[PDB]
Amino acid sequence: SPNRLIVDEAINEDNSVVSLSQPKMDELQLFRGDTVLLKGKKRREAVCIVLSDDTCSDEKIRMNRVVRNNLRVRLGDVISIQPCPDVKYGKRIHVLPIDDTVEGITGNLFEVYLKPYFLEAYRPIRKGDIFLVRGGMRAVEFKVVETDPSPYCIVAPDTVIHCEGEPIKR
Amino acid sequence: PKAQLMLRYPDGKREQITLPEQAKLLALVKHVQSKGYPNERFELLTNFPRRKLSHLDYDITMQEAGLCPQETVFVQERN
Numbered sequence: 312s313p314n315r316l317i318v319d320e321a322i323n324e325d326n327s328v329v330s331l332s333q334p335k336m337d338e339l340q341l342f343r344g345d346t347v348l349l350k351g352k353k354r355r356e357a358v359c360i361v362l363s364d365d366t367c368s369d370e371k372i373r374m375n376r377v378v379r380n381n382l383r384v385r386l387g388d389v390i391s392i393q394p395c396p397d398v399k400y401g402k403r404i405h406v407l408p409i410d411d412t413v414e415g416i417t418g419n420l421f422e423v424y425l426k427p428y429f430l431e432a433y434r435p436i437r438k439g440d441i442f443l444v445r446g447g448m449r450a451v452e453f454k455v456v457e458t459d460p461s462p463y464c465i466v467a468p469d470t471v472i473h474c475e476g477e478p479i480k481r
Numbered sequence: 482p483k484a485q486l487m488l489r490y491p492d493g494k495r496e497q498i499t500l501p502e503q504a505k506l507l508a509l510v511k512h513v514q515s516k517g518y519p520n521e522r523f524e525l526l527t528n529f530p531r532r533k534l535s536h537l538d539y540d541i542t543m544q545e546a547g548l549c550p551q552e553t554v555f556v557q558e559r560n
Contacts, residue, residue, distance in 0.1 A: 328529070342485070342487060342551050343551050343553060344487065344527075344529070344552065345487070345553070360528070360529070396495070399493050400491075400492070400493030431526060431531060432528060432531070433489070433528060433555060465493070467491070468491070468557060468558070
């Protein structure tokens with residue numbers, strides 16, 4: 312099972328990136344910057360960018376806290392990875408901030424958090440994802456409540472980013 | 482020797498091409514223009530780190546530009 316891999320901690324942390332050794336990337340025919348689809352526990356999935364890592368054991372995959380949570384997995388758990396070349400540019404995504412991260416937040420969440428977050432980075436995002444964005448006075452978490460196309464896409468410069476109304480829980 | 486480029490155009494369509502490593506960055510720019518995305522209106526980006534290739538001297542080789550052996554390159558309308 313060459314594409315089932317042991318979850319390991321990130322170095323050079325980013326919500327959109329996972330890292331493999333170059334051999335495992337050759338083993339699975341993955342190229343630099345390819346989008347990949349990851350499957351974790353409780354039928355949770357995630358879409359990420361894969362980069363090579365001379366620091367990563369062949370049978371392991373580096374990912375940060377955000378991605379591990381989206382996959383409901385912990386360090387040492389096992390996930391599977393597959394090529395995912397057909398993810399489209401998003402027409403539109405809908406995100407909502409987690410209530411307990413914006414309790415005192417004054418300001419425009421799109422201008423302070425989302426716009427620089429997504430700016431020219433071509434982040435893959437999936438319905439149900441929770442992600443942490445730094446900036447402002449304190450970091451804020453957002454939940455993806457809808458994407459178009461569904462259930463995942465690439466947030467491109469023309470992707471409309473909607474940040475609706477009331478914050479939500481969980 | 483050839484560089485493998487995964488091009489992502491602004492409509493989200495994808496194209497995998499090869500170019501000789503020794504070819505000018507200009508060859509890439511011209512290729513993207515023949516696909517309907519002219520240099521005067523579109524630019525070239527890579528991620529991780531974010532590099533704006535259209536800020537480089539186009540007389541530079543693909544290797545010098547850092548696109549070998551493989552790189553994902555984004556085509557984007559200029560601000």
